Every structure is written in C-alpha cells, then in structure tokens.
Design an enzyme around this catalytic site. Structure first.
Site, PDB file in Angstrom:
ATOM      1  N   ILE I  84     -48.789 -79.678  29.229  1.00 23.35           N
ATOM      2  CA  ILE I  84     -49.730 -78.955  30.087  1.00 23.35           C
ATOM      3  C   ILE I  84     -49.008 -77.858  30.889  1.00 23.35           C
ATOM      4  CG2 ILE I  84     -51.240 -79.272  32.142  1.00 23.35           C
ATOM      5  CD1 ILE I  84     -51.468 -82.182  30.491  1.00 23.35           C
ATOM      6  N   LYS I  85     -49.478 -76.617  30.708  1.00 18.78           N
ATOM      7  CA  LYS I  85     -48.968 -75.458  31.453  1.00 18.78           C
ATOM      8  C   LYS I  85     -49.572 -75.437  32.831  1.00 18.78           C
ATOM      9  CE  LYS I  85     -48.755 -71.294  29.332  1.00 18.78           C
ATOM     10  NZ  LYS I  85     -49.937 -70.506  28.846  1.00 18.78           N
ATOM     11  N   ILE I  86     -48.702 -75.416  33.823  1.00 21.17           N
ATOM     12  CA  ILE I  86     -49.131 -75.426  35.213  1.00 21.17           C
ATOM     13  C   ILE I  86     -48.467 -74.247  35.939  1.00 21.17           C
ATOM     14  CG2 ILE I  86     -48.973 -76.770  37.372  1.00 21.17           C
ATOM     15  CD1 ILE I  86     -49.965 -79.196  35.823  1.00 21.17           C
TER      16      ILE I  86
END
EC number: 2.2.1.2
Lengths: 213, 213, 216, 216, 210, 207, 208, 211, 209
Positions: I84-86
């Site tokens: 997951i890109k945060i």
C-alpha cells in the site's frame, strides 16, 4: 567570463522570451531542429541571428571537406553571428583548419570523448560541443567526459570554448556550471524549469495572502 | 599554450595528412622509420616544426660532432640524445651553442631532472615501455610533470612510447607539454561510434526535411 | 627556481664531472672530506670555489658566538662563493643575525625540526640544511619533516633556501623534488645513480642494432 | 604478527636475533656464507638449527629440471628450508611442481605486481619484492610493494610477502604501515630499530631519578 | 574494549578519587613520584595495587638483562597487578622475551619511534608506552608517531596494548581517543581538566536560577 | 577468492604452457576443439553460439553444454540474450554475458543470473571513454549487492590492464597469451639473475 | 535503530508521538513539567505510562549524597525513569554508584569529548551532548558530537549518545548521517520533519 | 573585498548600534519590520550603505514602475525583486537604467545563475528555509558561491534567511560576499563564555598588580 | 541482497517482457497509468500481481488516517503481493504504524528529504520512495538526497527498503546502484535503454558474418 546560455531551438517566440529575460546569448540550430519546424534553412538562420544578436550555430549538408568548406562560406555570408556546425571527423577537422584561417567561426559537434575535443581545439575550432545526455544514456557518464574536457582545456588555455550539449534536465546545467563550462546549450523547456522552485511559489503566496487581508 | 602533438613516423603522406588537419606540430624520427639526412630535410620542410633526429655515436665527442652536422640540415632539427653521462655532457655543450636537444630513453624522474638541469630543449619519458613492466609509465610521467611544474624548467616534456588513446588523454589530463604518437593512434583519436550514429541520424533527418517540399 | 644540486664532496675530479655535466650548482664540504684528499682547508675551499663557481658551504671551528663570527669573516674572504656552515644553536643563530647584516652568507646546519628551521629563516640564514637521512634512521620520517619545512617556507616566503641534506639515495632526491625543495645536496655516488636505468641500457642496445640493420 | 627475517649467514647475529625474540627466520645467499668462510649446505643446516624458522636458500640451476632436482636435495636438509626461486617462466613451473610436493618456495627478484600475481598463482610460499633496488631506479619500490600488498589482500593468496632489498629503518616502518607479512633485513638495519636519542636521554634521566630517590 | 585511563602518580588520595569516579583502571609509577610521597618503593607499589586493583607499572633499577630479569621477578611477587617497566633497549627486549615466557607482565617504555614499538610487540610486551609530549616538544609530532604505532598494531593485531604516555594536556587525550589508543596514562591534573567546561558551569547556574 | 586468469586463445600449446605454469584457470574462445581445450585446462571454457534469437541461442547452448561440464556459453548482451540467460541458468547451464560496455548492462546480466560478465575494457579505452573506470564501476556495484555473477575483465591489451584490474579486485581477467608472457618479465629480474650467477662463481673461487 | 525522544512534558504531543510510532522516549525538566500545570513526580509517572520508554528526569541536589538519594527515589516511580545527572565530579561519582545498583543514568551538560569519555567510563546509560548551545558559541556543536560518536565507536562503550540541544531539522539529519544513537528534540522540530512542499504538491496532483 | 554584514531590520536603534560598531554595511527590509518610503529614507541616511526594499507589484510593468519610484528615495536603495520570469525581465530593464537589484526567494543554484545573467546587483539565497526542509541550505549556498567563482559574475551573494551563528561562520568559511542577519544573531556573534571568564580574570590581575 | 528493479507501469505486456527477461521484481502503479491501459483499479492490480508475483505498490484514495487504513485493508485483500502506497504525511505515518502491526505492507511515497525518510522507517514502513528526478529538476540534487537516505539507513539497519523513485534516465539507475540502494523503480522506456550500447551493436555485426 560569464557563463553563456544558448537555446537548442528554431522557435522565434522562445528566443524572444530568452532575450526578453536577458539570459539567452545565442542559439544552436539543426537539421533535426529545423526538421521539427519546417521553414527556410537560410531564412530561419537570418531571422534567428537578427533576434538573438549572438552566436547562431547552423549545420552544413556536405560531409566531404570541399563541400563543407564551400557551404560554410555560403552560410557565413548570412550574418556575422553565424557559426558553422562541423561534425567531428577527419574531413571536418580539415575544414575547421581552413575555415578558422579565413575568420569563419566553427562549432565542432558530435564530440563524445576528450581525445576528439583536443583535436577540435588544436584545429582551431571556435566552439566544441560534447554530447552529455547521449553519453549518460549509454551509462558511460557524459558529465564525467565533459569534466575531462574542461580540465584539459583549462590545462592548455585553448581558445576554443566548450558548449555543453545534449542537455536534458536542470542538473545537467548545474553540474556544468559547477565545473565551469563556458556555455550550456539547452532546450527551452529546460530553461523554463531553471526559474522554478516550490519554495519560491510559497514565498510569493506568503506575500499575496496578506494583501487580501 | 597549446598541447603539441608530434608524429612518430618518417612517412610523409601521414605527416601531410597531419598538417592538413592542422593538428601535427612536429615529428620524432629514427633510422628504422630511405637515406637519413634527406628524410630529415623532407620532414622538416613538410611539418615546419620540431623534427627529432638521433645521432649514431655514443661518445661525447662523436655525439657533439654529429649533432652539429644534423643541426645544419634545418632550423627545425632537434637532436635526440640518449640519457647517459656523455649524452648529458653533450646537451650542456650543444645548448650553449643554440643547438636544440631531446633527451630520450628516460624512465625515471631522476633522469628527467638531470636532463632539464643540463639544458635539454625536450625530454622524452617512455610511458608504454614502463607500462609493460607493470611499473606504471603514466605515474612516472606524472612525477616528471609535477617536478617540472615545481621548478619551471624550460625543458618541455614529450610523452613518448605512446601506444593507445588513453595514454594521450591521461597525458593531456596531467598537462604534459607534448605527446608524440604513431599515426595509427592519431587516427583513433578522431573516432567514436556515437559520432557515426549522429552523422547517420543528421542525414536521415535532413533528407526527410528535404523530402518535405 | 630551477632545482639546484650541490655535491657533498671535497674531490675535485667529481666536481669537475659535475660541472662538465652542467648539473652541479655548488658544493657542501667538511674537514673530514678535505682532509681525506691530502688538501689543506683554505686552498681546497678556494680550489673548489674556482671549479664550481657556485655556493661552497664550509664549516667553522668555533661554537661560541664571537669565535664563529671571527672565523666566518676569515673564510668569507677566500671567495665570493663561500657560504659559512653554522650549527643550529642559540649562538649560531646570533652569529647568523650578525653575519647576514654584513653580507656574509650562511648555511644553518644540523636542523632536525621545523621549529629550528623557522628560527634559521627568521635570523636571516641564506640556507637551511635539514638532515633527512639521519631522521629517517630514527624511523621518525625525515622526508616528512622536510615537507613541513618546505610548507612553512612556502607560507611565509622566507628568503632562506632549503638544502635537503643527509641524502642517501635516489628516492630522497625524487621525493625532495616532488615537494619542490630549493636545493638537494648529495654524495657523488648518489648523483651517478640518478643517470641510470636498465631500460635506458636496453634501449641503447636496441637503437644500436636498429642502426646496424639500417646501414644495410 | 609481522615477521622479521635476517639477511645474513652470520650465526652470532642470528643468535642475538633469537635471544631478542624478534627474528623469525633467515634469508641467505652463497656470498654471505663465503664471507663467513663456509660451505653452503652446512651453513644452511647450522642456521636452520639456530633460528628454527624459515631459512630461504637459493639453488644453482636456472632450468626447470635442475631447479627442481636441487630444490629436493636442499629440502632434505631441514623442515625449515625454503627454496629461493628466481622469477622466471621456468622458476614458476618449478614452483608449481615443488608446491605439489610440499616443498616451500620463495620467489625472488620480483620487481612488479604482475610478477607477484604469477608467483602467488603458481603457489609460492613467499614472494620477495626488491624494494631498495627499485628505489634506486627512482621508480619507487615502496609503491610497488604497496600494490602487491593491495592485490594480495584483494584475493587472499596464501603466499606471504617478504619485503626484501631493505636498506634502512623507514623501509621497515613503511612496510609495517602497509601491513606486509614479513620484512627481511640486514642485521645492521635491525640494530638501528632499537635506537633513539630520546631513549638514551630518558635512561640518563632515569638513572638520575633512582639516584635521587635512594638518597632521600 | 573500553579505553583505559591510568594515572601517572604515586599519590593515594588521587588514586582513590580516580577509583571513586570509576574512571581510573591502573597506575604508572616511578621512584621520583613515590619519593615525593615520602614512601618506600616496594611498599608504595603494594598500596597502589590494593587501591586501584588494576595494572600498576613499576620500574626496575638495573639496565643489564640479568639484573632486569632478577628484579622483575622480585617486583612481580608483590602483587598480581604489578607490571614491570622495561626501557626500550636490546637487553630490555631480551628481558621481555624471558619475562613473557614466565607470565610476568611488562611495559616497554621510552618508545619514540614506530620501529621500537614493533620490536616491543614482537618480543611479547604486555604494553608499549610511546612518549607523545616529549616528541611534541622536539616539534617532530608525538601524536603522529603514536598514530603510526596504532596503525601498525591494528594491521597485525599484536596482543601488546598501547599506552599513550607523556600526556600533558586534554587534547593529547582527545586525539589519542579519536585514533583509538588502548590506554592513556596521564597526570591527575590532566584528568581533573577533562571534567571541566564553562558551559557546563553556566548550565548548572541556569538550572539553579529556575 | 584467488584471482583467476583465463586465456583468450584456442592454441593448445599456449594453454598447456599456461597449465604447466599453474597460472591459467580457464579459456575464453571465438571463431569440436572446445572439447580438446576443456580436457586440457579442466576449468571454464567459454564458447559462443551462432544464433541471435532467443530460441536459437538456447537450442545451441544446450548442444554446446553437452560437450563438457567445463563449457560456459557466451551470450551477447541483448534482450534475447538476457532472456536466454534466465532460461539457461534455470537449467544449470553456465553463461558468460559478453559485449558489455556499461555498468547498466552488467546489472541486467547479473540480475538475469549470468555466471560471468565480460566488460570490454580495451575497446572502451580506445574510444577514450576509459574502460578501466567502467570496469571499476561494475566491480563496485557487484560488491554492493554480492551478485553471484563473476566479472571477467575482457578486451585486455597490456600488463597495466591486468595490474589495474587486480588492484580493483576483479574476479577474473582474460588475456592474450602474449600479455601473459609479458607479466613474467622484468629487466631487473634479468640483471639479478646475471648477478646471481656471478656470486656462485665467486663463492666457488673462495675455498 | 535511531531513537527519537521528545523534549517535552506535554502529554498530547507525547500521545501524537506514540500514535505516529516515532517517539521512543522523553527528556524532561521541571520547567516543562510546571509549564503544563503538574508536579515533578506525578507527570513523570504519567509520561512513563504514555511513552513506555526511557523518560529522563533531573534531580534537585548537586552533592553526591543528595544526587544518589534522590535518584533512588525517582527510580522507584517507574522502570522507565532515567536519572539526569549533570557532568561534574560528584555527578560522575553518582553514576558509578547508581550504575552498580541498576539505576539508569543520563549524563547531561556535556560540551566536550573528554567529558563524554568520563561519562561512559563511569557507566552512564546515556550521555547528552548539547549541540545547539555549542553552535551558538560558533564553536560547532555538530563537530563535537561527531567526535564523541567517533570515540564511542572506537571503544564500543555501552553508553548511548543522545544528541541534545536540537533546534532544527538539519541537526537531526546531520546527527543521523553520523549515526548518533538517539536524538532528543522539541515537538515543533518533529512536526517540521514530516513536511516538504513537494509532498504537498504531489498530494494536490496525484489526489486529483 | 571584506565580508559584508547587513541587518534584517527596520529598527533604527539596532542599525545605529550596528554602525557604531562599524560592522553593519547595509540593511535588508520588508513592510513587516517597517512596523514604507520615509523609513527606507531614514535607514539609508543612517547606514549609508545598500538598503534593500521590496516592491508591491508582481507583473513586470508594475515592478519596473515601482522600482524607479523607490530608487529616487536615495542612491543607497536596492530594489528587492522576487525570483520569477517577470522579475528577471525587470532586472534586465532596471540594470540597464543603473537601478540596483536584489533577487530574492532564491532556493536553487539554477535560479542564481539566471539572476546573475540578468544582471542582478545581488542575489539572496534562503539558507534557513531550505535547512528546515532538511534539504541543506548551506550546501545550496555553497553551490552558488562555487558557480559565481567559476564565472566571476558581478552579482554579489547575500546569504539570507540566516537564523544562527553557525550559518554566519559557515557562510564566511565558503567566502560568501555578504551575510544578512537579524540583530539578535549579530549580538550572539560577540559572545563567548571564555571571553567573560578572561575579563573576570584580567580584572583580578589588575587588582593584584596594584599590590 | 540483489538489487531489485520495479517497473513504473500498469502495462501488462511490458511487465511480461520484464519477467521474461528475469529482471523485474515488482511494480509500482497509479490510476493515471492504469486508466491509460483503460482498466478498473483493483482488477488491474490483481492482474499485475499474478504476472510479476512480487511487490505491487498501489495507492489509496483517502488522505485521512481512518480512510487510509480502511482502504489499505481492502486493497491488501487482493493479493499477498500488494503493497500500500501511503503519502508522507502525519496521518500517513499514523496509518503505517497501524498497518505494520497488522502485517500489511506499506510504501511511503512523496519523500523529498532524509528527515521524512527516517520517520517512514521508524513508523515501520516496508518501503520508502524518495523522488530523485523531481528534486533534480529543482536543481537541489535528488541523487544527493537519495545518498543521504541510503547512508542513514545503513547507519541504523532500518528494515525499511529504499525504492529510488522518480527515475528518468540510465544514470539515475547507475548512480543509485553505485550507492547501493535496495530497489530502483523505473519506466519501461528507461529499462529498455539499459540493455543498449553502440559497441555491443558493432561487436554483433563483427560476428555477423
């Protein structure tokens, strides 16, 4: 002693913008670049010379010595600003010898090694144009080869001036300037980028927000 | 001043090619490279720059005798003297008579300092031969450059025993006065595969610009 | 500049060769050396001056200030080229202050530290002679101490010139040149070594067969 | 531990070296032995018994067959005998052969890092680069040694480096600073390593302080 | 292996302070220092040993090999913590070879070159004591000679430990620490200085002010 | 950890010469005899395939691999070559990625699972773009990541190439026999041998 | 490995710090504790409970006996409490004593590498060199920190370095580049560490 | 070629103390610190050196119009121009008319080159603001100083957004032309605890001398 | 310990070619990229995961903590390979702490400073993605900023791996490799260039007899 910025273009609006800003000292032009634009070769060069009133490099068609020299003399008569682009070859070096002796300015192009650069300077070239971006894309480090050419030219005070060419992005410009290249020739799009910084834009809002209040 | 390139040759077409290019400043010669004194005259008239030519004798008296005779051939003639005690004695004598000398077979910085102190016009360290001993000829050359910079000896350094392009580039990066090289090495200095591709591309493109009409 | 080479000798044949090669600028001497040649002190200092026509350093007997100065004046009268060797001592420094004011050249000798070398220059010595080989043998690195003195003298441009002394071998000479010392003084045996290289010999054997081939 | 060998055939100097607990082995040649009034083998046996560490001894022959022949005969004198082989093609062939038979070798007359790599690859026990002789060509023997040490560290060749042609204390210190395995030197050089003028002055002063302590 | 600090003293109050602080690991001694306490040599060495409970270096009288060894054995009997100071000489090095073999600890002192330090290590010295400040006064750079010894000893992993000796001032300590010398032996007066800084004092007044 | 020396040759006398000396660890070849060489050197013997398409390269590689356990397949640095290295590695067939002129190329060769990469030093040198620097960058990157791929310094022309490659710690240098011969030689060695014989003479006169 | 402590006694900023999973402990002074509206001991307890990591708290006394006495008292509040001791002779004596008893110490007011050596040899759990206060003297606090790091690496003292007197992001970055064990910083500095104008532009762009 | 110190202030007492010390060579201002025309005049008269003052407008025509108005206040007035395309256009124009310029809001060496090429009298890179992004403002300043040394641009570098003493020292160590700082930071530069102790001690020695 | 190469793409042909070559280890995506292929978000992420069978970084829509975590858990269900890109923000960092604790892999993106990179690692990010090319364009040197992060991460052995991102050309890749970055993510066009050299071509023709 100032660093010179040339534009890699034939677009006259971008050159006007460059001179408006008092940042553009000349233009380098091309087969490819005049292939992009599609106007009159000699015409376009005259227009550009009148606009920038500084060195405008323009390439010759022929690749044999005799034809290069013939065409160089022709292009030179367009304007005192015209500089003749000569490819780095044995015949091109012969041509630079001849043309320098008749006061015709030359820009040796397609230089990818310091050895080639030495020859160009010794033959009497007005400029040399090492192709940084194209070497970088081979992963053989074009900025390093540029740095070696600068070093050599500093050692010997060759009158030839170095035009960092095949410039793709701002860091090319900054690293060229940090090693003290004489000239950087770059696309307008790269020039535009050099003005910009997100902190500049925030600084300016920290002005403009205020006067609403 | 400029870096000088001499040719290690007696071939006159090569030398002609060299001067046509405006890149060859002189010639260093030897018997193996067809009558000696004539070939030297022809070469002098062609390059119109320093032409190094070796003497037969190894005793002081004979070296001096023969040097005086070779010097009469041309104002361009430089006498090659081997690095020996008698050779150094002959350099002292010849320098005092205005006869130009090139001390050759130099493989140490110690030898180079004696050559300069004796009054040699040139010294010729043998890079390639030292390289092959794996004792690093380029490092020994760099030591000699450094020492000569320290003291400003009038003697000029000719990087000799040059075998390939990197010898010439490394020599130029350390600021050697002169590099003497075979013509085959000179030819290589012009060349780069990216230059050839750039030439193919500039043509393809121009020819498509012309094809537009 | 030009880097100068002096010979540590009193032998006149060696000095004659040295000047025949055009490579020896001066001579540094001591009573032992002269004594070993069957020569009297003053004649031989004179003989050497006439031959080299360049600085010839000669030592005095006395160690007290008055005696050093007295004898320096006597030696200076032998020839314009005579340079008086003064040991690095308080009295020797005093003597240098005095002699420099009278136009008498001096060579401060027995220098083993950069501090000593600063005092020699400030007193006005014509030359200073750091003893490299002797420090090397203590494993305290004579070349390094020489490099520090060169660096200090470059910083201040003292008129005093540095003679690398106690030179034993060719690397001493090469390292001294690489740092830019003003003068190296060396034994003749060391000077002879400097001419030599095996590849030079092989090159000469080769250029002789090349010539004998060519005559054909 | 850094090893020290002695370049000698003198048994008194080797006994002192072992009394001091600082000499690990000996490098010899026929001229040292001849200077001692000695037959070659015997003097090698005597030295082996005394140093009880590696004793390098040369063979007469230069052809591969004769070198191997003679090496085998020398090796029978003592477990400590190490055979000196000159750096040649035939010498390198002999090293391959002799290493396979468990006979220890010292490749000598090495003047380049290329030579050193071959010696190690052939399986030499030791390699002896000649520092002082290179120095005298003004081509920097310590730099050559440093290149060999660097290469040997890169590849962890089992071959051990003997810094040879050692002429003075700085040679030893510099070899130690680069971490050569072994330094072989003349006894006269070893004697110098003990010495320092401040040590002497410290001892004069130490005797004065005992003397005063006792008096009070 | 923590850096060790030894004291150059024979004063027992200074040593007690040193151990109270948990900073002093041993003591280097000499007759002069002892003498100045009004104390006999062998007795004073015992009292120091009992107090520091760490390496206590003590010098022998003799300079010949046989006498140095004889005396070293006698001094070694005082306490397991006694280390015999041996001057750097041929006979001194002979003695170290002998004493090492008998389990008697030694400290080779009056070392002014890296060559001397090599031989000390090779002979089996427990410690070597390069004299930094006395070299410094010759303006031949004692810190550089110390760093050369440290380098050499790192290259070969000699068991011998380096005691930076003839320490005069705090920067000697700090530079010796930055090069990673094993032990620094210093006068108490130098140790006291190490605690001190004017900004510390100002900080203390400020977190008193409020 | 030992530096390897391969020979650029197909000459069996020079290879016997090399193994006699105990200094030649393998052979690199170019334009049948491959079996003879394998037998002689009993170490890695690199041999090139004819085809340039992926299918053909793999086909031929499998054929050449059957000649001997020592055979290493030369694959040119191309997309299809890299694809072929992936496939051949998975089958336990050893590969040598050749015609490498940039560090970027060497990374891909390693990542695809090449046994060896061969950077061409001398050819880059002659472009005056510095082949030894390019090799040094490849050594550095391979040390950063511990790729199992071993670097063969190739296009070696003279002794200094070998010495500089050694000083950087290249795994392997492949060289012409002529270069290997030069590595033995030094004029001071020759003089010392002349002197050595003089001292045995002396030593004999004196008893 | 790098730890971040907060120079604070404010519980909301400490909660934010632990929410983010980036604050490992707290360094305190009665100035902060009183600045909130609380007492020395109580808030030390509340902080310990919140951060569940090293919480440095200063003693009142400067004599050895009083420092030790108070240190024992403070240590009884929580296993997390670490006792701040000023770098003095008595302070070093106290560290020797309290180390032996398993009481954790943080030697503070350190302005030189010599002081840091003594602190480690006495058995300090932590040392706190005051970077910014040295910077203000124009004597370069980051250099003096770098020397202490270098010396502690040389000898592997078990004592951990807290870069203290941290005033801005570059202090944190430079400390990290040298590999300091811990940086203790005001909450305001922590908040800055999150921020970049290019991040904000990226957010306008991507989330768009 | 002395290093210049300017003050980030409009306070005249601070400026007076600065000129009394003989350390302050000019002043950089903004409307904030101003609590426009008359104060700029009062500052010019007091410092008698370069006084940078910003224009309201951001378009090229308005910038140039206002710059010429400000310039008439005093020969010492230098016009602050933000680093933008129009700002750089303005610099070209104003340089040609002998009106001195200070290009401000510089955060990259690329920007700094354009400012010098346009003929700016000064360029003001913002060191502290970059420092706070953790992108290292002193490094960017160093890059600009190296570039301007390479080419000898007549433009002088004013290290700006200076927050503390080490900024000043590091800017001096790289040889920046000018450093503009708050008074508070200037005050700090005088101070050292070893000076104070030396003065306590020097006193003690006088009263001992008087024995 | 191998250097990893990820592709900046949603194009499956390019990813297939990447895996065919055995040089692509993962993929970083965005909905710009996936829309250009004309595709739904989650289905494309799944297709990519199946194809590369390595880390596939995918961005969430929300910017508040609660929404980011909510969406992350949903994306994480698509495949074990999803990362997951945060974005590097306070809430984003809060979300990293929470998601790390649940075994959900994270890639902290929009990193332009070393300070940001330390917080990412301390919060427990799986990956950090410093934007080299965008910094380069400000003339503030993105490679230098990357080098500082690499240096810091070596100093402390943070488990977080660095993805050199915003890669625009072959020297970015070579300089990142020379510094020893863990991963480089690049456009396919840049990967293609890496194979190429004019001397390789000439060598081929020299055997093309």
């Amino acid at each position: 002693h100032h660093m010179k910025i040339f534009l890699d273009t034939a677009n006259l609006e971008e050159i006007k913008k460059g001179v408006e800003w008092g940042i553009v000292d000349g233009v380098t032009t091309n087969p490819t670049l005049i292939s992009k634009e599609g106007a009159e070769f000699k015409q376009r060069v005259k227009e550009i010379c009148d606009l920038v009133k500084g060195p405008v490099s323009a390439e010759v068609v022929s690749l044999d010595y005799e034809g290069m020299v013939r065409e160089a003399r022709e292009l030179a008569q367009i304007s005192e600003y015209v500089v003749i682009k000569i490819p780095m070859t044995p015949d091109g070096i012969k041509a630079v010898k001849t043309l320098s002796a008749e006061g015709i300015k030359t820009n040796v192009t397609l230089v990818f090694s310091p050895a080639q650069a030495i020859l160009a300077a010794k033959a009497g070239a007005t400029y040399v144009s090492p192709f940084v971006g194209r070497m970088d894309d081979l992963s053989n480090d074009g900025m390093r080869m540029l740095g070696e050419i600068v070093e050599i030219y500093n050692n010997y005070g060759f009158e030839t001036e170095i035009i960092a060419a095949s410039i793709r992005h701002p860091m090319h410009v900054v690293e060229a300037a940090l090693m003290g290249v004489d000239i950087v020739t770059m696309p307008f799009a790269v020039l535009e980028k050099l003005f910009k910084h997100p902190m500049t834009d925030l600084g300016i809002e920290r002005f403009m927000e205020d006067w609403k209040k």
